[PDB]
Design an enzyme around this catalytic site. Structure first.
Site, PDB file in Angstrom:
ATOM      1  N   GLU A  20       0.739  -1.364   0.250  1.00 54.11           N
ATOM      2  CA  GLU A  20      -0.479  -0.113  -0.223  1.00 54.11           C
ATOM      3  C   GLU A  20       0.855   1.005  -0.057  1.00 54.11           C
ATOM      4  O   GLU A  20       0.539   2.617  -0.401  1.00 54.11           O
ATOM      5  CB  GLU A  20      -1.016  -0.004   1.335  1.00 54.11           C
ATOM      6  CG  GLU A  20      -1.711  -0.970   1.290  1.00 54.11           C
ATOM      7  CD  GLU A  20      -2.199  -1.101   0.711  1.00 54.11           C
ATOM      8  OE1 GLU A  20      -3.563  -2.305  -0.101  1.00 54.11           O
ATOM      9  OE2 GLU A  20      -3.103   0.049  -0.183  1.00 54.11           O
ATOM     10  N   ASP A  34      -6.316   7.318  -4.286  1.00 55.39           N
ATOM     11  CA  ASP A  34      -5.805   5.443  -4.741  1.00 55.39           C
ATOM     12  C   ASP A  34      -6.249   4.648  -6.071  1.00 55.39           C
ATOM     13  O   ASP A  34      -6.461   5.744  -6.942  1.00 55.39           O
ATOM     14  CB  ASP A  34      -6.859   4.301  -3.644  1.00 55.39           C
ATOM     15  CG  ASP A  34      -8.265   4.138  -3.900  1.00 55.39           C
ATOM     16  OD1 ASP A  34      -9.041   3.438  -3.460  1.00 55.39           O
ATOM     17  OD2 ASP A  34      -8.796   4.240  -5.031  1.00 55.39           O
ATOM     18  N   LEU A  85      -8.904   4.098   3.290  1.00 55.56           N
ATOM     19  CA  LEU A  85     -10.139   4.357   2.688  1.00 55.56           C
ATOM     20  C   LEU A  85     -10.329   5.623   3.660  1.00 55.56           C
ATOM     21  O   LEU A  85     -10.597   5.388   4.229  1.00 55.56           O
ATOM     22  CB  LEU A  85     -11.044   3.555   1.805  1.00 55.56           C
ATOM     23  CG  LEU A  85     -12.309   3.837   1.308  1.00 55.56           C
ATOM     24  CD1 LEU A  85     -11.457   4.629   0.041  1.00 55.56           C
ATOM     25  CD2 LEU A  85     -12.966   3.630   1.206  1.00 55.56           C
ATOM     26  N   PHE A 108      -8.077  -6.814   2.768  1.00 53.60           N
ATOM     27  CA  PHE A 108      -7.829  -5.341   3.454  1.00 53.60           C
ATOM     28  C   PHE A 108      -7.890  -4.248   2.316  1.00 53.60           C
ATOM     29  O   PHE A 108      -8.299  -3.102   2.343  1.00 53.60           O
ATOM     30  CB  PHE A 108      -6.192  -5.535   3.744  1.00 53.60           C
ATOM     31  CG  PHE A 108      -5.896  -3.974   4.058  1.00 53.60           C
ATOM     32  CD1 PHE A 108      -5.371  -3.058   3.317  1.00 53.60           C
ATOM     33  CD2 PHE A 108      -5.496  -3.782   5.388  1.00 53.60           C
ATOM     34  CE1 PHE A 108      -4.747  -1.584   3.713  1.00 53.60           C
ATOM     35  CE2 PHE A 108      -4.982  -2.434   6.687  1.00 53.60           C
ATOM     36  CZ  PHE A 108      -4.803  -0.987   4.958  1.00 53.60           C
ATOM     37  N   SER A 151     -11.858 -19.411  -6.101  1.00 54.71           N
ATOM     38  CA  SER A 151     -10.885 -19.750  -5.788  1.00 54.71           C
ATOM     39  C   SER A 151     -10.610 -20.479  -4.296  1.00 54.71           C
ATOM     40  O   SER A 151     -10.115 -20.526  -3.745  1.00 54.71           O
ATOM     41  CB  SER A 151     -10.139 -18.532  -6.021  1.00 54.71           C
ATOM     42  OG  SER A 151     -10.458 -17.860  -7.685  1.00 54.71           O
ATOM     43  N   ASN A 157      -7.338 -19.637 -11.359  1.00 52.92           N
ATOM     44  CA  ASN A 157      -8.868 -18.916 -10.862  1.00 52.92           C
ATOM     45  C   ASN A 157      -9.016 -17.627 -10.392  1.00 52.92           C
ATOM     46  O   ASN A 157      -9.279 -16.576 -11.186  1.00 52.92           O
ATOM     47  CB  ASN A 157      -9.338 -20.163 -10.644  1.00 52.92           C
ATOM     48  CG  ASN A 157     -11.083 -19.427 -10.003  1.00 52.92           C
ATOM     49  OD1 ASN A 157     -11.034 -19.338  -9.035  1.00 52.92           O
ATOM     50  ND2 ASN A 157     -12.087 -19.226 -11.324  1.00 52.92           N
TER      51      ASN A 157
END
Ligand code: CL
Ligand code: CL
Length: 162
Positions: free
Chosen positions: A11, A20, A32, A104, A117, A132
C-alpha cells in the site's frame, strides 16, 4: 516478513490525503476515507478518524495507528465471515497473510465473491487457484500486486516480497 510488512509494501505510506487506484480519497497506509468525490467529505472523515482537526495531514504515528486498526478489523472480518473463516482456518500462516491482504484491499464482501478460488484454496489446489484468481477484474486492474498475493498463495513462501 509478516502481514504488516507485507501490506506496508503493497500500500505504501502517505501522510497527505491522496487518491487511490480507483480514485478514492485515502490516507496513510491504504486507509480509505470515502468513496465520495468531495475533498471536504474526505477531510471530514479524516478528522473523525483521527480525533482532531488535521487539515489533511497526519503524522507517521497516526498513520500507523490507523493501519493497526485496519489490520485488526480485516482479521476480525474474516473470522466473522461464514464463507471466509473456514478457508482461513484451513490455511498455513503465510497463506493466511495472503487472504488478509486481499481482504484489506477489497473488503470481506468482495473477497467472499471468489467462490471458486476459495474453494480451491480450501482444497489446497495451489496452481489451480492461482489460475482462477487471475481471471478477475482485480488482477487486470492491479496486476503487479495481484501477482504478488497470488504467488504467495501458490507457493506459500514470501518470495514475491523478497
Ligand atoms: Cl476509523
Ligand atoms: Cl499493481
Amino acid at each position: 516478513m509478516n502481514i504488516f510488512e507485507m501490506l506496508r509494501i503493497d500500500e505504501g505510506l502517505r501522510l497527505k490525503i491522496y487518491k487511490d487506484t480507483e480514485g478514492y480519497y485515502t490516507m496513510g497506509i491504504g486507509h480509505l476515507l470515502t468513496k465520495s468525490p468531495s475533498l471536504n467529505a474526505a477531510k471530514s472523515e479524516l478528522d473523525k478518524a483521527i480525533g482532531r482537526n488535521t487539515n489533511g495531514v497526519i503524522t507517521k504515528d497516526e498513520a500507523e495507528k490507523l493501519f493497526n486498526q485496519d489490520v485488526d478489523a480485516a482479521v476480525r472480518g474474516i473470522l466473522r465471515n461464514a464463507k471466509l473463516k473456514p478457508v482461513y482456518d484451513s490455511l498455513d500462516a503465510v497463506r493466511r497473510a495472503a487472504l488478509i491482504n486481499m481482504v484489506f484491499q477489497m473488503g470481506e464482501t468482495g473477497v467472499a465473491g471468489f467462490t471458486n478460488s476459495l474453494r480451491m484454496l480450501q482444497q489446497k489446489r495451489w496452481d489451480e487457484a492461482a489460475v482462477n484468481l487471475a481471471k478477475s477484474r482485480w488482477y487486470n486492474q492491479t496486476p503487479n500486486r495481484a501477482k504478488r498475493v497470488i504467488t504467495t498463495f501458490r507457493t506459500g513462501t514470501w518470495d514475491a516480497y523478497k
